[PDB]
Point group: C2
Chain length 208, copies 2
């Protein structure tokens, strides 16, 4: 049995959400860290990167690039992508909103120092006024433990991962959203997640 190998820098970056998805699915993976530019060029020259970039994940005989292609495959393979086309549409809608917000938090470190302030103010404004209220309303509407189909899916995983990043940004943001707090707790206690949240797991630290 082959363990998926994740090729990327030893960092959170664009590979973290995949790390969380595999860990939450209970899948064990190997990481092949890119230390130098020589490493990245070697991957390219071996014809391992379709569009010359990483993340790249070797899984089930394929060398998948593009974060979304990778996450979609894994979510499908481990039954984290809903029950049908309608459920996947809700999942996709929610996780694409999460990915818009997450793209902002992700690029924040590479943000121009002069902009680094308004950017971070924009991010917090969007979190309070757009995203958190949206997800809180979904949880509030059905009163269920999970975002979609009363069953664990990538939506819950991706959202909880994002709630940890927001917490790192400003622990006060989630305060007015009890249902999101509850979901964060509930998901963090899932055996697979808790183990990943523990020291020594493949989870990566904030980029400094």
């Amino acid at each position: 049995a082959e363990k998926p190998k994740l090729h990327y820098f030893n960092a959170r970056g664009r590979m973290e959400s995949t790390r969380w998805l595999l860990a939450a699915a209970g899948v064990e993976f190997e990481e092949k860290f890119i230390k130098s530019a020589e490493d990245l060029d070697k991957l390219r020259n071996d014809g391992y990167l379709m569009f010359q970039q990483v993340p790249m994940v070797e899984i089930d005989g394929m060398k998948l690039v593009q974060t979304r292609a990778i996450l979609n495959y894994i979510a499908s393979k481990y039954n984290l992508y809903g029950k049908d086309i309608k459920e996947r549409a809700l999942i996709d809608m929610y996780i694409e909103g999460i990915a818009d917000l997450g793209e902002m938090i992700l690029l924040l470190p590479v943000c121009p120092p002069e902009e680094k302030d308004a950017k971070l103010a924009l991010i917090k404004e969007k979190i309070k006024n757009r995203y958190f209220p949206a997800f809180e309303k979904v949880l509030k509407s059905h009163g269920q433990d999970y975002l979609v189909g009363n069953k664990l899916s990538r939506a819950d995983i991706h959202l909880v991962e994002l709630l940890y990043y927001v917490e790192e940004l400003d622990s006060s943001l989630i305060s007015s959203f009890p249902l999101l707090k509850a979901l964060k707790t509930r998901i963090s206690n899932l055996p697979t997640v808790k183990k990943f949240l523990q020291p020594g797991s493949p989870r990566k630290p904030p980029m400094d």
Copy 2:
């Protein structure tokens, strides 16, 4: 029978790829154009936009937002998303590469005049050295008419749509890629595509 209604500005924007997908699938749709800010605010206040933004597509009882959620649903519903999990992984990988490049061409008009030159030079460099060679190699590898599974899929549609935008940017770019030229012709002749490519179709013009 309900016809999907696309809510957006009377423009290409982020709604165009959906327009191409529905047209290529042979689905008839209605467009509810947003003329003023009052229109957009009305949609928001009606609770029609989950994350307060458009594109928004009313289809099968749902009000879907997020381009990818919309396209995924439509591609699945009309059998344009491959046969299985493995085929969808190739499709996703290819179309996410197309979407990275397309995001660049899409934002080009809103690009700072001082940057508008290097940006456009970066786009052309990536097209010649990264994306086109990648897709040409896929077509070359299996020698089939379609990108994935020897059957028409959203990958072919999304790629061909992108080839029209590149043509508008610089007709010379596709010259060294005969297989991509062939695919563009072959797909443009599909009855549904040809009709959409004809004057008077819902297809939108370049943003000026």
